[PDB]
């Protein structure tokens, strides 16, 4: 059985929570805290292990962006550190190809990264790869056919509808068709061989619209919108459905969790997080050992 894990986040300060939602019995399981409260991080899973990448520690004692990589083992309910990235990356995006973690974009202070680096778990080593054509913070990242896509974001001046595609074999980025909508802080994921971009912020409004990229047609198409507009949401796929968690709607830090069914093209609100928050890292892996 697999659960939806949400790590970190922001509500008045960065958070250390690790909680796991069971879509069947509806429970939230409170697990070992992050070593450091972090928001604006990303989550992913390699070899059953949950990784928390980047982010920022906003605390009443001071604020710092994070280069950290940390690993959670559900079999032991323990976190352990990994080697850090070359630079701190707040509002990062990540994707997994061939068992390697790609860290994309994000910010360090006023620096908006176009740089990208790759983590090899079997060596605990990071290595820089070719930088993106665009500086992107609040970038959404997805992997399709072992190509890495970076979608949207904020370049420090403009928010973006552009998307680009990384070919690992060429070590080269190439622009693709832009989204219909400018989005920073959207949730981006892959489902049934399409890239979905949900929500985000366009510099005026937080968004509820959702669009889907078909690589065969190189076209973005709108699908059903979410019930609640939200930026800095967490997103993941569990058993063929998309789940979006939390975020910010210009007024409150949401605890709403919505679920997209592709067969019916409908969003449903399925649970609430134990407290509202934005900027979480989210991923799916085996339930913890009791
Ligand atoms: Cl994430």
From Swiss-Prot:
**Consequence of mutating residue 10 to A?**
Loss of interaction with NFE2L2/NRF2. Strongly reduces repression of NFE2L2/NRF2-dependent gene expression. Loss of interaction with PGAM5
Which positions carry S-cGMP-cysteine?
110
Q: Spans of Kelch repeats, please give.
A: 3-48, 49-99, 100-146, 147-193, 194-240, 241-287
The record places the site described as Sensor for electrophilic agents at 110
Which ranges does the record mark as transmembrane? none
Report, as the record phrases it, the tissue specificity of this protein. Broadly expressed, with highest levels in skeletal muscle.
Highest rank taxon of the organism: Eukaryota
* Modification comment: Non-enzymatic covalent modifications of reactive cysteines by electrophile metabolites inactivate the BCR(KEAP1) complex. Accumulation of fumarate promotes the formation of cysteine S-succination (S-(2-succinyl)cysteine), leading to inactivate the BCR(KEAP1) complex and promote NFE2L2/NRF2 nuclear accumulation and activation. Nitric oxide-dependent 8-Nitro-cGMP formation promotes cysteine guanylation (S-cGMP-cysteine), leading to NFE2L2/NRF2 nuclear accumulation and activation.
Effect of changing residue 106 to C: reported as: In a lung adenocarcinoma patient; somatic mutation; strongly reduces interaction with NFE2L2/NRF2 and reduces repression of NFE2L2/NRF2-dependent gene expression
Q: Where in the cell is it found?
A: Cytoplasm; Nucleus
Reported effect of changing residue 154 to A?
Answer: Abolishes repression of NFE2L2/NRF2-dependent gene expression
Query: Which residues are modified to S-(2-succinyl)cysteine?
Result: 289
Query: What does the UniProt entry list as the effect of changing residue 40 to C?
Result: In a lung adenocarcinoma cell line; also in NSCLC cell lines; strongly reduces interaction with NFE2L2/NRF2 and reduces repression of NFE2L2/NRF2-dependent gene expression
Q: Into which family does the record put it?
A: Belongs to the KEAP1 family.
What is stated about domains?
KEAP1 contains reactive cysteine residues that act as sensors for endogenously produced and exogenously encountered small molecules, which react with sulfhydryl groups and modify the cysteine sensors, leading to impair ability of the BCR(KEAP1) complex to ubiquitinate target proteins.
Give the quaternary structure: Component of the BCR(KEAP1) E3 ubiquitin ligase complex, at least composed of 2 molecules of CUL3, 2 molecules of KEAP1, and RBX1. Interacts with NFE2L2/NRF2; the interaction is direct. Forms a ternary complex with NFE2L2/NRF2 and PGAM5. Interacts with (phosphorylated) SQSTM1/p62; the interaction is direct and inactivates the BCR(KEAP1) complex by sequestering it in inclusion bodies, promoting its degradation. Interacts with NFE2L1. Interacts with BPTF and PTMA. Interacts with MAP1LC3B. Interacts indirectly with ENC1. Interacts with SESN1 and SESN2. Interacts with HSP90AA1 and HSP90AB1. (Microbial infection) Interacts with ebolavirus protein VP24; this interaction activates transcription factor NFE2L2/NRF2 by blocking its interaction with KEAP1.
Function comment: Substrate-specific adapter of a BCR (BTB-CUL3-RBX1) E3 ubiquitin ligase complex that regulates the response to oxidative stress by targeting NFE2L2/NRF2 for ubiquitination. KEAP1 acts as a key sensor of oxidative and electrophilic stress: in normal conditions, the BCR(KEAP1) complex mediates ubiquitination and degradation of NFE2L2/NRF2, a transcription factor regulating expression of many cytoprotective genes.
Q: What is this protein called?
A: Kelch-like ECH-associated protein 1
Taxon lineage: Eukaryota, Metazoa, Chordata, Craniata, Vertebrata
């Amino acid at each position: 059985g697999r659960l939806i894990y949400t790590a970190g986040g922001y509500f008045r300060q960065s958070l250390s929570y690790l909680e796991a939602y069971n879509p069947s019995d509806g429970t939230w399981l409170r697990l070992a805290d992050l070593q450091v409260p972090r928001s604006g991080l990303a989550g992913c899973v390699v070899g059953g292990l949950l990784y928390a990448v980047g982010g920022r520690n906003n605390s009443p004692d001071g604020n710092t962006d994070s280069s950290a990589l940390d690993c959670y083992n559900p079999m032991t309910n323990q976190w352990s550190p990994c080697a850090p990235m070359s630079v701190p990356r707040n509002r990062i995006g990540v994707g997994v190809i061939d068992g390697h973690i790609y860290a994309v974009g994000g910010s360090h202070g006023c620096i908006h990264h176009n740089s990208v680096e790759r983590y090899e778990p079997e060596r605990d080593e990071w290595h820089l790869v070719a930088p993106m054509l665009t500086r992107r913070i609040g970038v959404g990242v997805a992997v399709l056919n072992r190509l890495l896509y970076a979608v949207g974001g904020f370049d420090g001046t403009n928010r973006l509808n552009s998307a680009e595609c990384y070919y690992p074999e060429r070590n080269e980025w190439r622009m693709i068709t832009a989204m219909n909508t400018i989005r920073s802080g959207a949730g981006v994921c892959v489902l049934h061989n399409c890239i979905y971009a949900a929500g985000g912020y366009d510099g005026q409004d937080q968004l509820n619209s959702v669009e889907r990229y078909d690589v065969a047609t190189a076209t973005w198409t709108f699908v059903a919108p979410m019930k609640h507009r939200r930026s800095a949401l967490g997103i993941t796929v569990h058993q063929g459905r998309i789940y979006v968690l939390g975020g910010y709607d210009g007024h409150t830090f949401l605890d709403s969790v919505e679920c997209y069914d592709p067969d019916t093209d409908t969003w449903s609100e399925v649970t609430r997080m134990t407290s509202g928050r934005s900027g979480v890292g989210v991923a799916v892996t085996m339930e913890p050992s009791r």
